[PDB]
Amino acid sequence: SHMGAAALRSCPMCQKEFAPRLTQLDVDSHLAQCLAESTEDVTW
Amino acid sequence: SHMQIFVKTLTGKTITLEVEPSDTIENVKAKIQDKEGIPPDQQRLIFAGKQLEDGRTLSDYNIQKESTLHLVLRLRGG
Numbered sequence A: 001s002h003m004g005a006a007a008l009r010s011c012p013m014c015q016k017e018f019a020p021r022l023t024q025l026d027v028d029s030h031l032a033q034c035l036a037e038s039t040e041d042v043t044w
Numbered sequence B: 001s002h003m004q005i006f007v008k009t010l011t012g013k014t015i016t017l018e019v020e021p022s023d024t025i026e027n028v029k030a031k032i033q034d035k036e037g038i039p040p041d042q043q044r045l046i047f048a049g050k051q052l053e054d055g056r057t058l059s060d061y062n063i064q065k066e067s068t069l070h071l072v073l074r075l076r077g078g
């Protein structure tokens, strides 16, 4: 199990498990669009 | 010493600006405003799976040179 490369494996905003063997850019990419859609700017 | 950083938006646009290690997230948006044309009070930064804000500095998020950051606008009244 050499997976990782991210501070989170599941979007803590919309509770969505991110794809495997992803990259810091992947999680961030979604976290950005999700964050914008979200109403609460909580720090995770 | 001055390091460079990149910030892409949800539209695909790629912004290239420079920032310091002692600077802050809000600062990065200050200069970016004159680039795209958006206020720092609406745009945000995302890196390391964490929400980058004025609450912390660049060195706080280990933001080195050539950092891949994103842009998120959370309109209040709009």
Ligand SMILES: [Zn+2]
Residues within 6 Å of the ligand: A011, A013, A014, A015, A016, A030, A031, A034
């Ligand atoms: Zn999400």
